[PDB]
């Protein structure tokens, strides 16, 4: 409104301070990138993308006819880390649930060789997937910075990735997670491996009523007993503080 930028900066740093974590949220208006939060130097450090990769995994699988958007991925009946994953689902349902096994099956369909060259073509992060086609986004060697992630989301939001328009639209329909007063929030979460603390992500964009698109990438540390929805909460408060929703 008439709120000073010092106050915006302080308000958003306090959302990270209150959660007792260290993180950054990067916003992009048109060409301009702004870095908020309580740990601004995270912006150009490299982290595994974790499930945020699901977005590119989907783009690639669909572009290369490894799946369709109505196709059902059967649960094989093995006990899963979460009961919510013990069901048959579409890619899109799997995006909302972040169903690692489905994205792993998709990655195996695509294959190491095809995955490696698609990730080069797209030049995502450090572009390196190593030798294990089914976990390189979760344990490395693939890594990416928060700046690169918000630029990725900015590409996909404006259909600039090197995939057909219809492939991009298909994956964007999968990413709708919230509606707030005429604004829509498209995004995918990520949560890295290992003992606490782990990396957390929420990367996407808001599509405003007038058609304007404002990409964001939140990146922070997931501390002992933090709920996943803290990523969402910090993100929503930040976007609201800045009047983007």
Ligand X SMILES: Cc1onc(-c2ccccc2)c1C(=O)N[C@H](C=O)[C@@H]1N[C@@H](C(=O)O)C(C)(C)S1
Segment near ligand X (CB under 6 A), from 20-28, 71-79, 135-143, 153-161? 135-143
CB 47 within 8 A of CB 143: yes
Please report the beta strands in the chain, taking only residues with DSSP state E, as ranges in sequence order.
Answer: 23-29, 32-37, 176-180, 183-191, 198-207, 213-222
Give the largest CA-CA distance in the chain: 56
Report the residue number, 31 or 79, with the smaller CB distance to ligand X.
Answer: 79
135 lies in the site for ligand X, by CB under 6 A: yes
Report the residue number, 159 or 196, with the smaller CB distance to ligand X.
Answer: 196
Binder among 190, 206, 242, 245 for ligand X (CB under 6 A): 190
Q: Which of 58, 61, 53, 59 is nearest to 163 (CA)?
A: 59
Binding mask 18-57 for ligand X (x = CB under 6 A): --------------------------------xx------
Active site annotation includes 51: yes
Q: How many whole angstroms separate alpha carbon 21 and alpha carbon 223?
A: 7
Q: What are phi and psi of 186, to 5 degrees?
A: -100, 135
Site for ligand X in 94-123 (CB under 6 A): 98, 100
Enumerate residues 6+ apart whose C-beta is below 8 A from 113. Answer: none
232 lies in the site for ligand X, by CB under 6 A: no
- Of 14, 51, 189, 238, the active-site residue reads 51
Q: How many whole angstroms separate alpha carbon 37 and alpha carbon 15?
A: 8
203 lies in the site for ligand X, by CB under 6 A: no
Q: Which residues pair with 218 in a beta bridge?
A: 25, 202
148: Cα separation from own chain's centroid = 11
Shortest separation between residue 15's beta carbon and ligand X, angstroms: 19
- Which ranges of 75-145 does DSSP label H, i.e. alpha helix? 91-97, 100-110, 112-122, 136-139
Task: Name the closest residue to ligand X (Cβ).
Answer: 51
Binder among 39, 40, 139, 177 for ligand X (CB under 6 A): 139
Binder among 47, 73, 124, 191 for ligand X (CB under 6 A): 191
Binder among 3, 72, 180, 193 for ligand X (CB under 6 A): 193
Active site residues: 51
Binding site for ligand X (CB under 6 A): 50-51, 98, 100, 135, 138-139, 189-191, 193, 228
């Amino acid at each position: 409104m008439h709120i000073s930028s010092q106050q915006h900066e302080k308000a958003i740093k306090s959302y990270f301070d209150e959660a007792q974590t260290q993180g950054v949220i990067i916003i992009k208006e048109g060409k301009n990138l702004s870095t908020y939060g309580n740990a601004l130097a995270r912006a150009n450090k490299e982290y595994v993308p974790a499930s945020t990769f699901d977005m590119l995994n989907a783009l690639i699988g669909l572009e290369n006819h490894k799946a369709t958007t109505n196709e059902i991925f059967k649960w094989d009946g093995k006990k899963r880390t979460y009961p919510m994953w013990e069901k048959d689902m579409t890619l899109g349902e799997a995006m909302a649930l972040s169903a690692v096994p489905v994205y792993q099956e998709l990655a195996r369909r695509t294959g190491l060789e095809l995955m490696q060259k698609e990730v080069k073509r797209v030049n995502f992060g450090n572009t390196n997937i190593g030798t294990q086609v089914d976990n390189f986004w979760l344990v490395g060697p693939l890594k990416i910075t928060p700046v690169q992630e918000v630029n990725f989301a900015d590409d996909l939001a404006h259909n600039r990735l090197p995939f057909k328009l219809e492939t991009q639209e298909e994956v964007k329909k999968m990413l709708l997670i919230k509606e707030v007063n005429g604004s829509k929030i498209y995004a995918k979460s990520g949560w890295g491996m290992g003992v606490t603390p782990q990396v957390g992500w929420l990367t996407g964009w808001v599509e405003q009523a007038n058609g304007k698109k404002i990409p964001f990438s939140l990146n922070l540390e997931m501390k002992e007993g933090m709920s996943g929805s803290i990523r969402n909460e910090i993100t929503y408060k930040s976007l609201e503080n800045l009047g983007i929703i």
